[PDB]
Amino acid sequence: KVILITGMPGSGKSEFAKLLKERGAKVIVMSDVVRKRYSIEAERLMDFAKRLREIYGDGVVARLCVEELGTSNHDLVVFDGVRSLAEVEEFKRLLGDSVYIVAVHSPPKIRYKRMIERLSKEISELIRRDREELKLGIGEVIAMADYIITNDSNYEEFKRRCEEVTDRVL
Amino acid sequence: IKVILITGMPGSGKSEFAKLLKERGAKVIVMSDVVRKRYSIEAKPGERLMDFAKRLREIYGDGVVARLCVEELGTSNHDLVVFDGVRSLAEVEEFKRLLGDSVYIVAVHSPPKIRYKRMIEEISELIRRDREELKLGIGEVIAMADYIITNDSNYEEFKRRCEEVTDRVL
Ligand SMILES: Nc1ncnc2c1ncn2[C@@H]1O[C@H](COP(=O)(O)O)[C@@H](O)[C@H]1O
DSSP states (O other): OEEEEEOOTTSOHHHHHHHHHHTTOEEEEHHHHHHHHHHHHOOOHHHHHHHHHHHHOTTHHHHHHHHHHOSOOOSOEEEEOOOOHHHHHHHHHHHOSOEEEEEEEOOHHHHHHHHHTOOOOOHHHHHHHHHHHHHHTHHHHHHTOSEEEEOOSOHHHHHHHHHHHHHHHO | OOEEEEEEOTTSSHHHHHHHHHHHTOEEEEHHHHHHHHHHHHOOTTOOHHHHHHHHHHHHOTTHHHHHHHHHHOTTOOSOEEEEOOOOHHHHHHHHHHHOSOEEEEEEEOOHHHHHHHHHOOHHHHHHHHHHHHHHTHHHHHHTOSEEEEOOSOHHHHHHHHHHHHHHHO
């Protein structure tokens, strides 16, 4: 049983990842995986990830994350940060038929405000960055999701929504 | 005037949200109906609808259907309007350029297997049609939505979810 978590920047998707860590799931952050490769073979992080997808194909990060998983039994595996259907397709080829996409949604202005409130923050730059993420294919993953969780109110409503999706998946 | 843009994948029940608004008294313009009107004056004999839709975008740019839908509205109309079936962010931007900044995107979500299950009661064809809709840019509209309504249980819960969103918009 595998959960692929996707969401736009500032959606709070890692909060869903955190809730799954607490329930005993193996959680693998896809960017942590690319970063391990980066320290070895880097050059900004986005630049190195681009080179990987050109050399090895669009599903590369999924292959890398499966390597990181290794050969072990887990009740629940979670991959936090899926960006394309090419990745989803590699997770399915490698891990089988019990793979689910969960998107965490927040409208653009809410996400922008969360990011601007962090401890560039120009609105034009946050807009350009959504657009780069969309060009990688994240909108296609969201549109084809098994579950979409809205994070547009408080933490406690979000946590309840996360819990009920988890129950449906399990 | 308030502008409600409805987006969703084939078999998602986006038309049911449109229906509900229509039933409340809203002016609902169906984007594919506007395409069919153009079809009767510009299409090649026997041309597939999706093929014609792609050719209009080649000739007039990615925002055409929105422009056509605004011309359908008329300059003389200043009431709330609903456009059923937005396919891309280029359409959204055209609606904003022409009708201003009270523009709301509501996505109706259903997961792939559920939507396919509804339509069948040819699978590779359906998957193919989904791929064409994604290439038009529908996933980016969903990813950037103000509200995502999930239709994955029964009609009544879906209706209550639609009512809540429409209350927030009004
Ligand atoms: N913005 C648009 N909205 C809806 N339909 C469109 C648009 N542009 C082209 N079309 C054509 O209309 C078909 C049916 O639309 P719908 O009735 O919403 O499923 C689509 O698959 C397209 O081929």
